[PDB]
Design a protein around this ligand. Structure first.
Ligand code: DGD
Ligand code: CLA
Ligand code: CLA
Ligand code: CLA
Ligand code: CLA
Ligand code: CLA
Ligand code: CLA
Ligand code: BCR
Ligand code: BCR
Ligand code: BCR
Ligand code: LMT
Ligand code: HTG
Ligand code: CA
Ligand code: CL
Ligand code: CL
Ligand code: CL
Ligand code: FE2
Lengths: 334, 81, 341, 38, 137, 451
């Protein structure tokens, strides 16, 4: 075989400790670049003028941050959605002042994670598997896209993309609530149903299978040793687990079919999170949460507050305080 | 099974619908009238649209005393003349 | 075989809805908590406790109705219908917020009831009681948030109110006043919930995509039998796939499912610990080093200081209507505001 | 900066080409069962 | 509290004559104000110039006085700056400029009166909320 | 009842349309009936819009998305986009609605009455998915149809009234396009532009000559390509690159539509040439810019020297420089300086916004337009309360740009998901393990251990 043929065989080999594959051919360098730039920036990058008003925000550890406060800071509002690679800067110092690391990292990362999804398809194909694990992964991926790419596009600036840091994430959330009332948006509510529900069903399934483990061990050893990797027999009694849960609620609320059950386990959080992503991605174009501000009115016309109006007051606090030196005109239109 | 009649049987039986084509509308109408007669307001002490404020008042009738709270609410209601 | 044993017989009959001894506690309390919530949100105001409309009767929708907490002046009164506040008057009792304590308490005892149900049925069927054990996390969350937290504060008023938008308000209050997102116990909570969701998703998808062909159908659900001895999917293939994709993989099914119990249960427990702290205003509010630097150096800015500015806005702009018993009057000139907005 | 740009352009083109030609190199056949998918 | 004839009684002119609007008039007023005015004047403020609001005290100190029906009807026909010095129909909706502000085209005298009445009654209902802006939300 | 249960078809009811894969007649039925649904909604929705249409209100104040599409084509409108005759809208609606009856008729016929398979009935209309020749032929037919469509746009623009041109000198107006851009350097020039800020890829097309010329090119390209695919059969490298099956083809088309949906989202969000702001309302950038303009005008009237006014941050309160030096509006709207619009461009000089022009040349119609657009920014709630999320109820408004952008992002996303689904499945089915792993021939069991 010729060199290219050999190379292809290696790339797509099912015997590599970590599968490479063609998606991996793109994934590996982009994820490495994103990772390296991220670590160096998080430790050592100078303050970044996120909002384009010459008010640099310090993100890195060496410049006064800890793990909780630190971040790689989004690129300058002056850049907006312009492409700002290293070679567009007059110098690395300019590049750093304007938040170049952020763009390098999120673009390399979004590409790399997309290829990660593709790679999940690819290995499933090489191993003779069914292909849809990658579809499950599309949910967290879509969310990543929502906060790093789509929301910036809609608002016209990567300065509004989610910061790469813990406190920065919280900042993104609070400003988001101010400007979109995301809590009153049904797609975010479906997202909450997705992750609360995912947690519920995770615990539920975990506990039901654990409850019906077939006795294979003594009391002085871990029950886990009762399962051996690759054994053909199922390790728990699903009829007993179903007897239990079916009696816990009523019989027809419970799954007797393991395939049906596991499909449910996949579908609930995945769909919920799909809607969370779509929530962010559509509030990106300012179609916002329900607004029931002053919706209840008495016979004279006095406003009768509901809990929605209290929410509105909180949001007002966030709105009037955020980016306190950036607005010169009365409406925050992006 | 656990001895009860299948729901499929029941809800597709003629007798079930002879019973419930009466009992369901009756209940629905009862609740409807509970609202339309105004009884709900008085059972639960909920303000009608013209009973949140007296005409020139703009202060919420907030309960501020634990043990004479009842009397406070009664006073607040009298204050609507 | 005396009356106790006859009663036990009847309680444990294999009917459509299992009753059990635990059912005697569970069903009335769960029924009264659900019914109380529906009654309140359909018909009952919050005018006299919060200055809020909160029912369908008043014009609220599903998102905005709530059964609201009592007035702050009630303190932590049990607020029993026959108690010294309502004095047996059902209407006044509703007006004073009696349904809130009614629902929280019948609810608490209902949750006790449900977990007892889990033990009782597990014992009757012959399984290990890990489902009940896992249900301890919902309990910890309910008890820390609806009971301990307000008991630490001035009154039931600052407990969450039972409603969608009301809960959203609870969230925003915790951000503005407690800086709750900064709290490492909440963070562990988040890690447990999102990690739980991740495990749910990935496990379901993995099982569904390593299925053995056990039928001829292109729709593969029918090719399973609850009574079958064989694993319905390939653990070996699943293991190789995830080993080559992520670097590591489960190889032990028992450990896998125990872990699925462990992550979200532990997460919720940690969040509970944090809220118990917030009951005393024992917050993770600040980083002292941050504040010393920022106070001395007007050019030092991080996302932490940014978020505190947001919190200060929330507090000043929400407190007067959210805390009406305080009679706050904040003149315009003292309201914190950035330029223009 | 110009050298950096040229360098990155050459790199990216290299890997992208690897990807495309890679998937053009009889990929359907690279599975454990039915290989004749042409 | 109710929307009483007294609430609905507003100054007709500068000379102390009042007019009592019907409830239908009040509703028509809210509808027409939302239709032709609220895009800028929601809640009694002015989005494209927040310095000027629709509060009755403000209208009263305007030139000519705008805190009565005649003043507001006139304003909707021939709007002026606050001091009355400039006619601003070219940049503010009016019957005079219905050609460039097309929503003004189907507005009748009756309509202008209803809008005027809304502007005068609404602060009697909402107090400081009217012209208050977000502080009073 | 052939193939209409799980036992015989292999597919459950919830995947019931998968039972149609090799039943070309019934499948034809499903498709023609669906086309009927599409045409039906076009017509019905148009009539609904027209019934609810007040001509002296801006379209975008009235929740319209189709009438704007008709108006952009030059039908029914005059200078400034004023509605001068609604009858064309009425015609478009009625004719689509009438046509949907025909399509639905054919669809229902083929779906439950006509030959269930077409192959025995007609060699022309019959097809095997694995028959690469026939597939590329049908593909060819439809390419020719698409080319014809694009040419219909060209013909409307050049020989049947023209198009609404928001950039028309003296103000927006319907204009006949007489000199379409034919230069490939320009046309494909758009195709090679960066999608990032100030570039915008094909979304940046900003004159009707380029649009028309583009559709001339696309029309010829599609007709040529269609003939090509009728007359040829896929080459070897193609054969070895693709999966050749119904589900595979569906997956390819799903990928395509996902891409197009994203592209359209951006188009309606940024572009104000083929989505005139007269009809669709201002873009986000446009409204933000308009606010800056509005207060520059107000304050300068009050006596402010807007060129030298230093804002709190040190940057100009009204005017500042872009990172490449152009004079642009200050405040947050610094992010939107790539915006271009007929009401703002007269203030633009070679170095950007011109201070002298700003001081002396701003017309009342510009003030008006800036105020209108500032106060109709594409922000609003799900229940259509116009404005920022903290605004009180009063204005019933969500921009058509928001509706269109959000809807098509949702659809494009789910269509990407659908692409992954059906591509992965097509691969697995072609290789023959879509139903699961063969226990007696489990591939991993024949592979060396990883360690
Ligand atoms: C096979 C595919 C392989 C792909 C491999 C990767 C190649 C690169 C892909 C780039 C992806 C997006 C990059 C940035 C996109 C963007 O900033 O998009 C914006 C651009 C438009 O750009 C804007 O275009 C505007 C043009 O308008 C100008 O011209 C107009 C004329 O009327 C007006 O005058 C206007 O005012 C004026 O400014 C301006 O130039 C703006 O400055 C400019 O930002 O859209 C566009 O170019 C085109 C639309 C691109 C699609 C949007 C991406 C969506 C991806 C979602 C994926 C989710 C995945 C989930 C997985 C699980
Ligand atoms: C087992 C189910 C159950 C449980 C655990 C509870 C529990 C509660 N109920 Mg609920 N309730 C229930 C069913 C239940 N309820 C039912 C079925 C109804 C419909 C009738 C109600 C209707 C109801 C209302 C209207 C109210 C409550 C309230 C309460 C709370 C206060 C009760 C109390 O102080 O009792 C005290 C009494 C006991 C604990 C009984 C113990 C008796 C001992 C063990 C035996 C000795 C008795 C002795 C011989 C009597 C001598 C009396 C003599 C001196 C005169 C408590 C959380 C109150 C509340 O929530 O306010 C916020 C309230 O207002 N309940
Ligand atoms: C646009 C949506 C759409 C369309 C065009 C189709 C079309 C089709 N489906 Mg699918 N399907 C759909 C959605 C759709 N489906 C959905 C949402 C589900 C999940 C509920 C399914 C689940 C499903 C299953 C399980 C099966 C199909 C089958 C079929 C085919 C045969 C139907 C038949 O023989 O029934 C006979 C039905 C009748 C006799 C009742 C009347 C039906 C007609 C069409 C009503 C027409 C009403 C219309 C207003 C009349 C206008 C008249 C006017 C023009 C003069 C047909 C091509 C079958 C198939 O593939 O067979 C090979 C099949 O087994 N479908
Ligand atoms: C041109 C577009 C297109 C076409 C022709 C197909 C065709 C097919 N799909 Mg695919 N699919 C698509 C897009 C498409 N899909 C998209 C965009 C997604 C992402 C969600 C999928 C995800 C998907 C999955 C997971 C599966 C299929 C399957 C199939 C096959 C069976 C479909 C069926 O009978 O469903 C019957 C229809 C229903 C059961 C209706 C579902 C109800 C939807 C979710 C309601 C949506 C809400 C609505 C828009 C708004 C609310 C309305 C309400 C208030 C009334 C058939 C070949 C099946 C397959 O693999 O076959 C081989 C299958 O398992 N598709
Ligand atoms: C391209 C799609 C599209 C867009 C952008 C619009 C936009 C608009 N419509 Mg139109 N319309 C559409 C399709 C669309 N519509 C369809 C399919 C119908 C038939 C139902 C109509 C019939 C219609 C009427 C009768 C009216 C409108 C009106 C409007 C305006 C107000 C919208 C509103 O308040 O929504 C409210 C928002 C919702 C109801 C939320 C929808 C969310 C969906 C259900 C989520 C779906 C997600 C996904 C598809 C599900 C997949 C499942 C997953 C598991 C895979 C707005 C301009 C109004 C107007 O002003 O006319 C002048 C009006 O009266 N529309
Ligand atoms: C669009 C897709 C489509 C396709 C591929 C077919 C294909 C077929 N049809 Mg069906 N059918 C369709 C749509 C379609 N039809 C529609 C829309 C209707 C409602 C009118 C019908 C109603 C129908 C009936 C009642 C019958 C058929 C029959 C047939 C078969 C015989 C065709 C023939 O010999 O005609 C010969 C070709 C001509 C006479 C030339 C046609 C001239 C065309 C119509 C002029 C317009 C062309 C222009 C491009 C139209 C644009 C429409 C677009 C804008 C929407 C063939 C398999 C027959 C059958 O199945 O026998 C068993 C049969 O009896 N069709
Ligand atoms: C509906 C549209 C359509 C579809 C589905 C097809 C499908 C096909 N064409 Mg056809 N073709 C079409 C329209 C279409 N054609 C038109 C309009 C023309 C005239 C321009 C042609 C002229 C044509 C020729 C000359 C040939 C084909 C061939 C083919 C076959 C293999 C093509 C392939 O591998 O593409 C995949 C695309 C590639 C492999 C290109 C390189 C990959 C790069 C990386 C793509 C990057 C693009 C980028 C993501 C897009 C962003 C925008 C960009 C401008 C920057 C396939 C059946 C081949 C064939 O087998 O004919 C018998 C062939 O030789 N077509
Ligand atoms: C409190 C109290 C009590 C109690 C009472 C009760 C117990 C009640 C109950 C009540 C009830 C028990 C009620 C109920 C109600 C219900 C309702 C009101 C419902 C509604 C529904 C709906 C609305 C639906 C919706 C939906 C969903 C959910 C999903 C699907 C879709 C839809 C949309 C359909 C007593 C006397 C002891 C004492 C005093 C106090
Ligand atoms: C296949 C199938 C299906 C589907 C179907 C379909 C989808 C169908 C469609 C169909 C269609 C798509 C139809 C249509 C129709 C239409 C019509 C029938 C129309 C008519 C019209 C008219 C009559 C008009 C009138 C008028 C005028 C003329 C003027 C103006 C006014 C008015 C409007 C009045 C299903 C799923 C069910 C299932 C089974 C299978
Ligand atoms: C009309 C118009 C225009 C024009 C346009 C044009 C001229 C367009 C063209 C366009 C084009 C010209 C497009 C193209 C596209 C392409 C694509 C989209 C591709 C795809 C590919 C693929 C998908 C492949 C894949 C693969 C790979 C990569 C590896 C191997 C295997 C396979 C084959 C799978 C303008 C802008 C001027 C203006 C406006 C109007
Ligand atoms: C910018 C993107 C570039 C676009 C380029 C478009 C090119 C279109 C024509 C591509 C020609 C494909 O040519 C493709 O490459 C080499 C040529 O030796 C072949 O080489 C491959 O053959 C077999 C196929 O089973 C493989 O197992 C083996 O690994 C490899 O040698 C492919 O089988 C052939 O199909
Ligand atoms: C509470 C449980 C108390 C059980 S009481 C128990 O009941 C028997 C009959 O059932 C009697 O025979 C016995 O004397 C008595 O102690
Ligand atoms: Ca051909
Ligand atoms: Cl901020
Ligand atoms: Cl600003
Ligand atoms: Cl003032
Ligand atoms: Fe499991």
């Amino acid at each position: 075989a010729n060199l290219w043929e050999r190379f292809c065989n290696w790339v797509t080999s099912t015997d590599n400790r970590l599968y490479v594959g063609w998606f991996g051919v793109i994934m590996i360098p982009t994820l490495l670049a994103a990772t390296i730039c991220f670590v160096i920036a998080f430790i050592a990058a100078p303050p970044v003028d996120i909002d384009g008003i010459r008010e640099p925000v310090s993100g890195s550890l060496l410049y006064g941050n800890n793990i909780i406060t630190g971040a790689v800071v989004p690129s300058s509002n002056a850049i907006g959605l312009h492409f700002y690679p290293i070679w567009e800067a007059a110098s690395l110092d300019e590049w750093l002042y304007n938040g170049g690391p952020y763009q390098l990292i999120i673009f390399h990362f979004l590409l790399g994670a997309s290829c990660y999804m593709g790679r999940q398809w690819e290995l499933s194909y090489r191993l003779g598997m069914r292909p849809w694990i990658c579809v499950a992964y599309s949910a967290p991926l879509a969310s990543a896209f929502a906060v790093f790419l789509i929301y910036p596009i809609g608002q016209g600036s990567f300065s509004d993309g989610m910061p790469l840091g813990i406190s920065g994430t919280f900042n993104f959330m609070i400003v988001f609530q101010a400007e979109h009332n995301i809590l009153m948006h049904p797609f975010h509510q479906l997202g909450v149903a997705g992750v609360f529900g995912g947690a519920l069903f995770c615990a539920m399934h975990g506990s039901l299978v654990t409850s019906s483990l077939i006795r294979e061990t003594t009391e002085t050893e871990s029950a886990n040793y009762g399962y051996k990797f690759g054994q053909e027999e199922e390790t728990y009694n699903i009829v007993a687990a179903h007897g239990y849960f079916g009696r816990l609620i009523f019989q027809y609320a419970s799954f007797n079919n393991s395939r049906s059950l596991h499909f449910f386990l996949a579908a609930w959080p995945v769909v919920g999170v799909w809607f969370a992503a779509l929530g962010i991605s559509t509030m990106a174009f300012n179609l916002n949460g329900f607004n029931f501000n002053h919706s209840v009115i008495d016979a004279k016309g006095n406003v009768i507050n509901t809990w929605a109006d209290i929410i509105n007051r909180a949001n007002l606090g966030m709105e009037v305080m955020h980016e306190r030196n950036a607005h010169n005109f009365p409406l925050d239109l992006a | 099974t656990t001895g009860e009649r299948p729901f499929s049987d029941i809800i597709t039986s003629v007798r079930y619908w002879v019973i419930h084509s009466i009992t369901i509308p009756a209940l629905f109408i009862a609740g409807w009238l509970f609202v339309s007669t105004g009884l709900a307001y008085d059972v639960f002490g909920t303000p009608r649209p013209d009973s949140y404020y007296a005409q020139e008042q703009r202060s919420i009738p907030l309960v501020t005393d634990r043990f004479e709270a009842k009397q406070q609410v009664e006073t607040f209601l009298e204050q609507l003349k | 075989r005396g009356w106790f044993d006859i009663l036990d017989d009847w309680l444990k009959r294999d009917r459509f809805v299992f009753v059990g001894w635990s059912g005697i506690l569970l069903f009335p309390c769960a029924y009264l908590a659900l019914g109380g919530w529906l009654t309140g949100t359909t018909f009952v105001t919050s005018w006299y406790t919060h200055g809020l409309a909160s029912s369908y009767l008043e014009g609220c929708n599903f998102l905005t109705v709530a059964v609201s907490t009592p007035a702050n002046s009630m303190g932590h009164s049990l607020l029993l219908l026959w108690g010294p506040e309502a004095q047996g008057d059902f209407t006044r009792w509703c007006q004073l917020g009696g349904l809130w304590t009614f629902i929280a308490l019948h609810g608490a005892f209902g949750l006790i009831g449900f977990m007892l149900r889990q033990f009782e049925i597990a014992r009757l069927v012959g399984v290990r009681p890990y489902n009940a054990i896992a249900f301890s996390a919902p309990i910890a969350v309910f008890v820390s948030v609806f009971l301990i937290y307000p008991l630490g504060q001035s009154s039931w008023f600052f407990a969450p109110s039972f409603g969608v938008a009301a809960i959203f308000r609870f969230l925003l209050f915790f951000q503005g006043f407690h800086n709750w997102t900064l709290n490492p116990f909440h963070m562990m909570g988040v890690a447990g919930v999102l990690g739980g969701a991740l495990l749910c998703a990935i496990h379901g998808a993995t099982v569904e995509n390593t299925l053995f062909q056990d039928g001829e159908g292109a729709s593969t659900f029918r090719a399973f039998n609850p009574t079958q001895a064989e694993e319905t999917y390939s653990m070996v293939t699943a293991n190789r796939f995830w080993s080559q994709i992520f670097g590591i993989a489960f190889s032990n099914k028992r450990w896998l499912h125990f872990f699925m119990l462990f992550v979200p249960v532990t997460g919720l427990w940690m969040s509970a610990i944090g809220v118990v702290g917030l009951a005393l205003n024992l917050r993770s509010y600040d980083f002292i080093s941050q504040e010393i630097r920022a106070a001395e150096d007007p050019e030092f800015e991080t996302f932490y200081t940014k978020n505190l500015l947001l919190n200060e806005g929330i507090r000043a702009w929400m407190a007067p209507q959210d805390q009406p018993h305080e009679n706050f009057v904040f003149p315009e000139e003292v309201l914190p505001r950035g330029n223009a907005l | 900066m110009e050298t950096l740009k040229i360098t990155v352009y050459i790199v990216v083109t290299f890997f992208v080409l690897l990807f495309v030609f890679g998937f053009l190199s009889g990929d359907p056949a690279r599975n454990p069962k039915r290989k004749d998918l042409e | 509290a109710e929307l009483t004839p007294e609430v609905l009684t507003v100054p007709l002119n500068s000379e102390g004559k009042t007019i009592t609007l019907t409830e239908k008039q009040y509703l028509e007023g809210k509808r027409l104000f939302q239709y032709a005015c609220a895009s800028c004047h929601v809640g009694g403020i002015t989005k494209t110039n927040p310095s000027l609001d629709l509060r009755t005290e403000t209208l009263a100190l305007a030139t000519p006085p705008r805190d009565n029906i005649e003043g507001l009807v006139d304003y909707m026909k021939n709007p002026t700056t606050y001091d009355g010095e400039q006619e601003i129909a070219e940049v503010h909706p009016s019957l005079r400029s219905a050609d460039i502000f097309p929503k003004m085209r189907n507005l009748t005298e009756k309509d202008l009166v209803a809008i005027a009445g809304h502007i005068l009654v609404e602060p009697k209902i909402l107090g400081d909320k009217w012209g208050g802006g977000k502080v009073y939300y | 009842a052939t193939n209409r249960d799980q036992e015989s078809s292999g597919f459950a009811w919830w995947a019931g349309n998968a039972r149609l894969i090799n039943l070309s007649g019934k499948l034809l039925g499903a498709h023609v009936a669906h086309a009927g649904l599409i045409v039906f909604w076009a017509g019905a929705m148009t009539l609904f819009e027209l019934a609810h249409f007040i001509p002296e209100k801006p379209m975008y104040e009235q929740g319209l998305i189709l009438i704007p599409h008709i108006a952009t084509l030059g039908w029914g409108v005059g200078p400034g986009g004023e509605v001068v005759d609604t009858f064309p809208f009425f015609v478009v609606g009625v004719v689509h609605l009438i046509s949907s009856a025909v399509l639905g008729f054919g669809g229902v016929y083929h779906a439950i009455r006509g030959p269930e398979t077409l192959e025995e009935y007609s060699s022309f209309f019959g097809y095997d998915w694995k028959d690469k020749n026939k597939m590329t032929t049908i593909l060819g037919f439809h390419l020719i149809v698409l080319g014809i469509g694009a040419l219909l746009l060209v013909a409307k623009a050049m020989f049947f009234g023209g198009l609404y041109d928001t950039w028309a000198p003296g103000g927006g107006d319907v204009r006949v396009i007489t000199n379409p851009t034919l230069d490939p350097r320009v046309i494909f020039g758009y195709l090679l532009k960066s999608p990032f800020g100030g570039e915008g890829w094909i979304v940046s097309v900003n004159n009707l000559e380029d649009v028309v010329g583009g559709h001339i090119w696309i029309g010829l390209i599609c007709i040529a390509g269609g003939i090509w695919h009728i007359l040829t059969t896929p080459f070897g490298w193609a054969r070895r690159a693709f999966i050749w099956s119904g589900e595979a083809y569906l997956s390819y088309s799903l990928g395509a539509l996902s891409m197009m949906g994203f592209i359209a989202t951006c188009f309606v969000w940024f572009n104000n040439t083929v989505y005139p702001s007269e009809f669709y309302g201002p873009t986000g950038p446009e409204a933000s810019q308009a606010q800056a303009m509005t207060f520059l005008i107000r304050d300068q009237k009050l006596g402010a020297n807007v060129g030298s006014a230093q804002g709190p941050t040190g940057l100009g309160k009204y005017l500042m420089r872009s990172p490449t030096g152009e004079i642009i509006f200050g405040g947050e709207t610094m992010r939107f300086w790539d915006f271009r619009g007929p009401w703002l461009e007269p203030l633009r000089g070679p170095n950007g916004l011109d201070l002298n022009k700003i001081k002396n040349d701003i017309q009342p119609w510009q003030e008006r337009r800036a105020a209108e657009y500032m106060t109709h920014a594409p922000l609003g709630s799900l229940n259509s309360v116009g404005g920022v999320a903290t605004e009180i109820n009063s204005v019933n408004f969500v921009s058509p740009r928001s509706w269109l952008a959000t809807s098509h992002f949702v659809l494009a996303f789910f269509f990407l998901v659908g692409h992954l689904w059906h591509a992965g499945r097509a691969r697995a089915a072609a290789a023959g393990f879509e139903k699961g792993i063969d226990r007696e021939s489990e591939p991993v069991l024949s592979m060396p251990s990883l360690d």
